Design a protein around this ligand. Structure first.
Ligand code: YEK
Length: 182
């Protein structure tokens, strides 16, 4: 409807796949080459389904900060025959707060879903399903089961992936440029 939805749509149409693990179907963001991200609670194994194609996982790393605290981001390298558009220049370098964010989801359950979530707070620490987690962004939207892995954008920036909610607020794990240097 406006430039926020325009940027979100551009990221969804070229830089997302549907990932299926034994824990469910997730929106998965492709970042560059064959490297993508997914919430760590997806429990990625040796094999994953990507748009219903059986795919070998070449590498998977559950990120933690230098306090050895969960970040809830898993980086996955896929044995896929095609590279993602390189979007690393849309990743923030530092932790920050944001205005006017969109949460975008694409699954069998929620195709072509875009949610204007509004103001995003650098929340920091969250006890996420019992697990101490750092670098959490918070927005005041009642997000639902099915939205995990959803991409959080502003105009010009890809800032996080949706990892949970409490019925009234939703929570994303930050994406930082430093996660994807090679
Ligand atoms: C050279 O360093 C890497 O390989 C990193 C940690 C950088 C981003 C992709 N990965 S990954 C596939 O998750 O291993």
């Amino acid at each position: 409807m406006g430039p926020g939805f325009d940027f979100a749509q551009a990221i969804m149409k070229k830089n997302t796949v549907i990932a299926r693990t034994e824990k469910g179907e997730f929106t998965m963001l492709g970042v560059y080459d064959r490297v993508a991200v997914i919430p760590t609670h997806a429990s990625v194994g040796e094999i994953i389904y990507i748009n219903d194609v059986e795919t070998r996982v070449l590498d998977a790393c559950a990120l933690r900060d230098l306090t050895d605290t969960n970040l809830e981001i898993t980086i996955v390298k896929l044995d896929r025959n095609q590279k993602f558009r390189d979007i690393r220049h849309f990743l923030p370098r530092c932790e920050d707060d944001y205005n006017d964010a969109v949460l975008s989801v694409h699954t069998s359950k929620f195709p072509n879903m875009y949610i204007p979530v509004g103001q995003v707070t650098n929340y920091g620490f969250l006890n996420l399903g019992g697990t101490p987690t750092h670098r959490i962004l918070m927005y005041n939207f009642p997000t639902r089961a099915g939205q995990c892995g959803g991409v959080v954008t502003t105009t010009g920036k890809v800032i996080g992936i949706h990892v949970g909610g409490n019925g009234a607020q939703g929570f994303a794990a930050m994406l930082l440029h430093s996660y994807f240097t090679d």
